């Protein structure tokens, strides 16, 4: 196994009982890249809830947290605002590659995603947009990068 | 019509009577994408003038403001410095896509543009470099993105 | 000659006597693009040493400083943290183009580089990752951009 992962669904409707159509796809793509999926957390578009969810993964030593949702242009979308202050160092390369690949694939919500990416504690944290198309394209870009970052951290033999 | 737009020409020479060769091209490309062009404002490379021009569009409820000029490497180029503090949220995807497309087209002043992009109030604000080549390539990248952001805002039915 | 350049090797091992395998390649690529190479400085992954090295080039009026190393994900990698506060204006276009080209070439440490770029005083400063592959790909992207920025500054006839 490459490492442990957690998925955070950032969606007001999912947090009140609607069918989450994105999370299972993220889970299966993580598993197919070789990650153990420790769990899925659903939160509202709420800064402190999102922070609590990520910080909980960070304190439990999770290797990869993928948040899904809350990267659009409306004031309610606060995943990036919630994430950025938790980052000890940003990895613009991840966020830029996700936007760039989504734009080339014609997935607008991915090209325009305000998502950030970085290391918090021992955890790689990456925001992706909420749609199935964004999760598909974002995950294809992200997972080899995440494998390399995580493999590099454990080859430090720290 | 997709929405209302304003063009802000940021150019010391144009502000003192020289022929503006970029503004008419921006106007015609906006019109061809379906925007009403409310007007054109000419300002110097001057932070408070640029801010006044943009804030005036913001308070009038304009949907898209394209600023043209003042994104180069010299100290006089202050469009990005003027713009960034007005943004309630940045849209790095727009600025990155404009740079990336300009670089692939060999338009140096576009690849290297310090331009930013984001939402201020109800207005999408985007900096592009001053040349005809930069306006051509920047507008081709920008206008479908702007249509999608604006169509999304009005489909909120707010 | 296009201008004067300095190379700063940011590497703990090189700073204690190991063979620097990257610096000669950077020197030869600079020379081949037409820069005079004023010198090479070796420093540790140490914020104040890196700053001293860059600020020394800035005060001596150097046109281009390329730093090599210290852009990875581990806490010891501090080239970007050292560089960013010295920049009077950032040139995201350079850093983004370096990441983007490295990603397309399959050079992971380049796609993921946290390197920044910008103008400090009269000096263009650009961080690249430490490997030979990163220096090869980064330099191919950087040197035409650097020539254009420097040629533009001296054509100001300031």
């Amino acid at each position: 196994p490459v490492g442990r992962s957690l998925v955070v669904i950032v969606n007001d409707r999912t947090a009140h009982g609607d069918q989450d159509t994105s999370g299972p796809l993220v889970t299966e793509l993580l598993a197919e890249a070789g990650f153990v999926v420790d769990g899925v957390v659903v939160v509202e578009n709420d800064l402190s809830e999102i922070q609590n969810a990520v910080n909980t993964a960070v304190i439990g030593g999770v290797d990869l947290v993928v948040t899904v949702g809350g990267t659009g242009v409306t004031p309610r979308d606060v995943a990036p605002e919630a994430t950025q202050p938790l980052l000890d160092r940003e990895l613009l390369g991840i966020a830029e590659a996700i936007r760039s690949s989504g734009l080339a694939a014609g997935v607008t919500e991915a090209g325009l995603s305000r998502g950030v990416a970085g290391i918090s504690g021992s955890t790689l944290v990456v925001n992706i947009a909420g749609s199935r198309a964004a999760v598909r394209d974002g995950m294809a870009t992200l997972t080899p990068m995440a494998i390399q970052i995580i493999e590099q951290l454990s080859s430090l033999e720290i």
Side-chain angles (χ1 to χ4, degrees), chain A residues 1-155:
Chain A
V2 169
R4 288 160 57 227
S5 59
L6 182 91
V7 185
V8 180
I9 296 305
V10 181
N11 196 294
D12 293 324
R13 284 171 198 178
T14 309
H16 309 127
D18 279 9
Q19 178 174 333
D20 176 15
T21 267
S22 272
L25 180 58
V26 182
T27 287
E28 197 57 18
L29 291 161
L30 284 168
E32 289 174 354
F35 293 84
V36 169
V37 182
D38 283 353
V40 176
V41 179
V42 180
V43 296
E44 295 172 316
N45 259 297
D46 178 276
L47 192 135
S48 74
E49 290 181 31
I50 301 166
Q51 287 192 339
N52 283 336
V54 172
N55 283 333
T56 297
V58 169
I59 205 172
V62 172
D63 303 294
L64 177 61
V65 169
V66 178
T67 71
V68 178
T71 62
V73 307
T74 76
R76 186 78 193 168
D77 295 290
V78 298
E81 287 79 2
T83 303
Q84 185 70 31
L86 310 179
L87 298 182
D88 299 302
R89 67 190 19 178
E90 59 188 5
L91 292 167
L92 281 174
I94 294 175
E96 295 170 3
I98 290 168
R99 280 188 282 270
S100 178
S101 170
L103 187 59
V107 182
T108 302
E109 64 272 16
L112 291 177
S113 175
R114 298 187 306 105
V116 302
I119 300 300
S120 187
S122 72
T123 308
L124 177 59
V125 187
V126 186
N127 302 148
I128 73 199
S131 67
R132 286 177 70 83
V135 161
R136 247 173 221 295
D137 191 78
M139 290 296 293
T141 294
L142 166 66
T143 59
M145 295 174 107
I147 291 170
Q148 274 153 329
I149 290 170
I150 291 147
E151 258 161 26
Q152 191 194 328
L153 290 178
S154 55
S155 103

